[PDB]
Short mmCIF file of C-alpha atoms in Angstrom, two decimals:
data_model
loop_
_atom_site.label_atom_id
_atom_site.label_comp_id
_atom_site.label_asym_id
_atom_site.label_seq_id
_atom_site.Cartn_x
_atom_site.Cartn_y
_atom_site.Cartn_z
CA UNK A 1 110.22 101.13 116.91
CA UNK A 2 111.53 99.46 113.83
CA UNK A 3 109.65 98.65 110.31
CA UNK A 4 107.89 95.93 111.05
CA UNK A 5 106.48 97.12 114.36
CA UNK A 6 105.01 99.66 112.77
CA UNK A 7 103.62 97.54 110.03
CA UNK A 8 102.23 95.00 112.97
CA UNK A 9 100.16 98.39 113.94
CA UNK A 10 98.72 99.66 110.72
CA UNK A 11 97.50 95.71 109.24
CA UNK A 12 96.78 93.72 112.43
CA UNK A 13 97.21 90.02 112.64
CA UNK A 14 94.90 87.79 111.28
CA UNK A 15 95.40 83.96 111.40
CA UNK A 16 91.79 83.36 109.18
CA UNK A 17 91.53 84.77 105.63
CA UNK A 18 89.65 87.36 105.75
CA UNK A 19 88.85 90.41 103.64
CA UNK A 20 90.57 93.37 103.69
CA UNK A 21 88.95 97.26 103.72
CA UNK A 22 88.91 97.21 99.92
CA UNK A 23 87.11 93.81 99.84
CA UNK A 24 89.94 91.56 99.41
CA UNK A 25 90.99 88.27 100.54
CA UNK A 26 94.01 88.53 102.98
CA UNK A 27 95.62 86.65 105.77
CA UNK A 28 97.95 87.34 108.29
CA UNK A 29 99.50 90.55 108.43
CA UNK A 30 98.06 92.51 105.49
CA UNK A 31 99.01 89.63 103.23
CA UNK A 32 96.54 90.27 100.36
CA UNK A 33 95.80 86.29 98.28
CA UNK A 34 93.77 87.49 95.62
CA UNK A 35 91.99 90.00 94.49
CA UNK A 36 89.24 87.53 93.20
CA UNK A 37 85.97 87.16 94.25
CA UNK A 38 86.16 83.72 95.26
CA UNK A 39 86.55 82.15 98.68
CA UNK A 40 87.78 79.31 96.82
CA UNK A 41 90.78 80.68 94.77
CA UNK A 42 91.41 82.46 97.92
CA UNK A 43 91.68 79.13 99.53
CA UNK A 44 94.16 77.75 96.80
CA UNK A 45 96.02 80.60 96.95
CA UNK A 46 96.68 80.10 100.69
CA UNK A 47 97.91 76.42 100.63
CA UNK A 48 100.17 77.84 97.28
CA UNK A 49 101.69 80.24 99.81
CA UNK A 50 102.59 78.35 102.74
CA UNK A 51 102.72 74.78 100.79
CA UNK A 52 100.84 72.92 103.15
CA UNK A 53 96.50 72.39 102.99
CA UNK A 54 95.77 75.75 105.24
CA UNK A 55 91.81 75.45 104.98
CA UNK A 56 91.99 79.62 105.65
CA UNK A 57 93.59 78.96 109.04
CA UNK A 58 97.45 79.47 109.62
CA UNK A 59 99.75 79.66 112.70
CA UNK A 60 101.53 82.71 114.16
CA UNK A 61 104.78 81.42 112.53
CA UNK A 62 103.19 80.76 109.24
CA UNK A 63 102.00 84.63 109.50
CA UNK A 64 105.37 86.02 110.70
CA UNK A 65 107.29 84.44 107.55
CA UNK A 66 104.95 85.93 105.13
CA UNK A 67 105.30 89.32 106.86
CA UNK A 68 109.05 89.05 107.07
CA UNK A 69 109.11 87.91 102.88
CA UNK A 70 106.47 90.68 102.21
CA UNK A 71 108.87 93.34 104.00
CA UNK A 72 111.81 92.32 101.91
CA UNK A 73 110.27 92.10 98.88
CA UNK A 74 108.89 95.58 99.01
CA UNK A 75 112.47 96.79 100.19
CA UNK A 76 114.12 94.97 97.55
CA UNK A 77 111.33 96.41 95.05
CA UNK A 78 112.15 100.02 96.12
CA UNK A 79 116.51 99.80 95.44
CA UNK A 80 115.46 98.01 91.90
CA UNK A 81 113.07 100.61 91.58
CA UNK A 82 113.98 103.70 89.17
CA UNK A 83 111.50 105.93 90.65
CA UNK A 84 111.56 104.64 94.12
CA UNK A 85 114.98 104.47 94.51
CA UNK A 86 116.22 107.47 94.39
CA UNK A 87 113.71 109.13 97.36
CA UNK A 88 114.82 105.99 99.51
CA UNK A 89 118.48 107.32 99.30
CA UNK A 90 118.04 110.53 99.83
CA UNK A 91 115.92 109.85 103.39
CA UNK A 92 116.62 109.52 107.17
CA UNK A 93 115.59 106.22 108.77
CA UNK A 94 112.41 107.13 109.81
CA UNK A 95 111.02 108.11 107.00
CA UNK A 96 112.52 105.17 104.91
CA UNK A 97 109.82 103.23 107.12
CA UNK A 98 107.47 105.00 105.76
CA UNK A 99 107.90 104.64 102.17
CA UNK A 100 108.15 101.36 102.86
CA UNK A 101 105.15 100.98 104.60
CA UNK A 102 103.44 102.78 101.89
CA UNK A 103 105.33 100.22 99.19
CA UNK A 104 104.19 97.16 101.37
CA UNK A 105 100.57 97.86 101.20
CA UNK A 106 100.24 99.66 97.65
CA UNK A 107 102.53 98.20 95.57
CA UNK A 108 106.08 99.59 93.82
CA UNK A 109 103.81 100.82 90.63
CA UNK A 110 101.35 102.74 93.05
CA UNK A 111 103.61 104.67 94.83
CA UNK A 112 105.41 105.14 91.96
CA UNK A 113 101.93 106.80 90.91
CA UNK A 114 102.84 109.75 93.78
CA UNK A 115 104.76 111.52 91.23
CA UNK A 116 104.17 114.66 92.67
CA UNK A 117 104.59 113.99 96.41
CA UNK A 118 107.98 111.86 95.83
CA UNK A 119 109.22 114.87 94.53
CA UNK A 120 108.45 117.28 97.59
CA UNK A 121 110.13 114.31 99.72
CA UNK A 122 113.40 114.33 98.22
CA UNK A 123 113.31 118.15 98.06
CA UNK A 124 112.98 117.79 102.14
CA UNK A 125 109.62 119.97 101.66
CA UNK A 126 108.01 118.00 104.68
CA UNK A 127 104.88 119.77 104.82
CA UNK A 128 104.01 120.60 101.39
CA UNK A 129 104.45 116.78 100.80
CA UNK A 130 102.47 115.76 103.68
CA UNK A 131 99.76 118.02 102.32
CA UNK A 132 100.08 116.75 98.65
CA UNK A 133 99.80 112.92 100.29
CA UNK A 134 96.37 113.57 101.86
CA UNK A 135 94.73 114.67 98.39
CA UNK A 136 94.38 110.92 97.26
CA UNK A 137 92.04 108.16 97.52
CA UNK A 138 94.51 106.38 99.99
CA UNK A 139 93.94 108.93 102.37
CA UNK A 140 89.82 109.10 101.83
CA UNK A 141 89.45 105.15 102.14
CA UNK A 142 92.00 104.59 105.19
CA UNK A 143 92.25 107.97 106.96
CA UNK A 144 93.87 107.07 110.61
CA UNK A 145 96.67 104.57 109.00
CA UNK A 146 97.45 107.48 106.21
CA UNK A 147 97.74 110.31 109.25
CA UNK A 148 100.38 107.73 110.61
CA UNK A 149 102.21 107.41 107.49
CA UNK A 150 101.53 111.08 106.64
CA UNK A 151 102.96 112.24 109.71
CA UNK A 152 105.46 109.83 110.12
CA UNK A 153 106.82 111.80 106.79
CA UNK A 154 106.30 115.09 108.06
CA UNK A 155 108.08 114.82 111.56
CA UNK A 156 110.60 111.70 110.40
CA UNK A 157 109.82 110.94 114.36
CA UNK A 158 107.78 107.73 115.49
CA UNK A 159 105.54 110.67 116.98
CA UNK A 160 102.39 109.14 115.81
CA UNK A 161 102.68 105.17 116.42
CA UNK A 162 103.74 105.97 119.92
CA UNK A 163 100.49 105.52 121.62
CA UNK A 164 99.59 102.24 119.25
#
């Protein structure tokens, strides 16, 4: 299992836009266009993207290059992160995945937000972070994908994506 397996799991793959849990336009995998309500600027926002007239409908290969520049940018965004950066360093492999996973679908300034929690991580206190983790809105909107990333961070084993 490697980072962008376990990305693959939690977001799907979508080749039509279509709107995420939240109520946003998205394509691919978990690649979020806009969070406007129009169809239309979703549309534009698309073609702007890939730089070709999508109409809402990409290939596989179109999807896989957005994942793989949406993976480095929020890798990238941790290490130039001053918040961020630090808890990357100080974790094993596994659970590097899952901050990034966390970065990739919330943003650098949301996690950032997990003030509390980032602090139990780099202190190695596994299960008083995972508890701390749960206690957000993350975890009340999108329970079963935050249990993955939740446990991925309490174990640092690929325990819970096994099955997926």
């Amino acid at each position: 299992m490697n980072i962008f397996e376990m990305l693959r799991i939690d977001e799907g793959l979508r080749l039509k836009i279509y709107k995420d849990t939240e109520g946003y336009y998205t394509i691919g995998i978990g690649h979020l266009l806009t969070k406007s309500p129009s169809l239309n600027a979703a549309k534009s926002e698309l073609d702007k993207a890939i730089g070709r007239n999508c109409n809402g409908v990409i290939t596989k290969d179109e999807a896989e290059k957005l994942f793989n520049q949406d993976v480095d940018a929020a890798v990238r965004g941790i290490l130039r992160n001053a918040k961020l950066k630090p808890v990357y360093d100080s974790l094993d492999a596994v659970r590097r995945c899952a901050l990034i996973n966390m970065v990739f679908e919330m943003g650098e300034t949301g996690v950032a937000g997990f003030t509390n929690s980032l602090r139990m991580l780099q202190q190695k206190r596994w299960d008083e972070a995972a508890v701390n983790l749960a206690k957000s809105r993350w975890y009340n909107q999108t329970p079963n994908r935050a249990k993955r990333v939740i446990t991925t961070f309490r174990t640092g084993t690929w325990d819970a994506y096994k099955n997926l």
